[PDB]
Amino acid sequence: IQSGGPRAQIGTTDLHIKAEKLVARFIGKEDALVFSMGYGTNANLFNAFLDKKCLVISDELNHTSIRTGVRLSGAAVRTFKHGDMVGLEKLIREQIVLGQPKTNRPWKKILICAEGLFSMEGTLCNLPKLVELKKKYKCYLFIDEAHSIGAMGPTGRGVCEIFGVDPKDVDILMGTFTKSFGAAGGY
Amino acid sequence: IQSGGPRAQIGTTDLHIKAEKLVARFIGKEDALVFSMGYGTNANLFNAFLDKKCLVISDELNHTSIRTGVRLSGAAVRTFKHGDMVGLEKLIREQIVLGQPKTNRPWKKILICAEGLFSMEGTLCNLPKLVELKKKYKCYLFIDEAHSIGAMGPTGRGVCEIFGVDPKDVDILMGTFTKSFGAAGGY
């Protein structure tokens, strides 16, 4: 029941490797990492590939861990109404035109954050339209499948299975094993 | 008394080479070209290294050939009062901040055009201050020595000699042989 240390020092075993391979095969992607806490995963993720010159467009009903992870990095944030896609397109166009505040230089990066199933409304995210806009305006997509993975779809693969979307147009997927698998951690 | 054709096809002789070397040695620079008309020189110069994304800051009393050469390329133009350097510094700072019109992206290039001696006032250009601002704000300098070369200075080298400025901080110099040398052409 004891671990040695961080995964980069002595912490890795063969079980971690097997779990990563199995998760990657299950989802439909190429590689994966597993962490010991979902909240920690969201909190410490965005800090790695975002700065104060990038921008994040997020739905107004996202989780708190995403908000803390965005706040720790320093990026700018704008939000759109829940379930409105015309507002999302208008906001994307206006923010590409305007540029960084006080300087109007081009945004170094743009990232769109959504949630597979919002666990206060029961509604889903319009994944096809998000992928369409993502393709058109050269943005990026980040999906949080905590309440979706394992429990929804014809075979339980999430929202990509539900919408028949190829799970390749979604840049980053993450979730937790706590909700439908009776365990702890995230990926 | 006859020429063959353009300099790039059959037009070059050894006399052109000797004249170019002699002019380059006389001025204090490394290389030079000679053209058959000063007006044509100014008209067709700027078209080679300027586009619609660069900017030109020129004095309000420049010659007409410079204006036509700038108009043919497509660059933007702003002017400053004659003999005012605080206005020049303020304009440089504001135009670096603002950026390209309608888009506010950074100016791809900035060029400052002046004249060694304005042949309607008899006044000189404040070359030391221009070189100072040029060094500080990373601009470029273009000087038109038509009435200055050959006729002014302790030995007749122009305004660089008058102001003891090293003729290396001035990016491009041009002039004519018509005014003080009793000939035709430009360099």
From Swiss-Prot, chains A, B:
Gene Ontology cellular-component terms listed: endoplasmic reticulum; membrane; serine palmitoyltransferase complex
Gene Ontology biological-process annotations: ceramide biosynthetic process; intracellular sphingolipid homeostasis; sphingolipid biosynthetic process; sphingosine biosynthetic process
Cysteines engaged in disulfide bonds, as pairs: none
Cell location: Cytoplasm; Endoplasmic reticulum; Membrane
Keywords tagged on the record: Acyltransferase, Cytoplasm, Endoplasmic reticulum, Lipid metabolism, Membrane, Pyridoxal phosphate, Sphingolipid metabolism, Transferase, Transmembrane, Transmembrane helix
N6-(pyridoxal phosphate)lysine PTM positions: K179
Main location: cytoplasm
Function: Catalytic subunit of serine palmitoyltransferase (SPT), which catalyzes the committed step in the synthesis of sphingolipids, the condensation of serine with palmitoyl CoA to form the long chain base 3-ketosphinganine.
Additional note from the record: Present with 54500 molecules/cell in log phase SD medium.
Family named by the database record: Belongs to the class-II pyridoxal-phosphate-dependent aminotransferase family.
Name of this protein: Serine palmitoyltransferase 2
Gene (name only): LCB2
Full-protein interval shown: 188 to 374 of 561
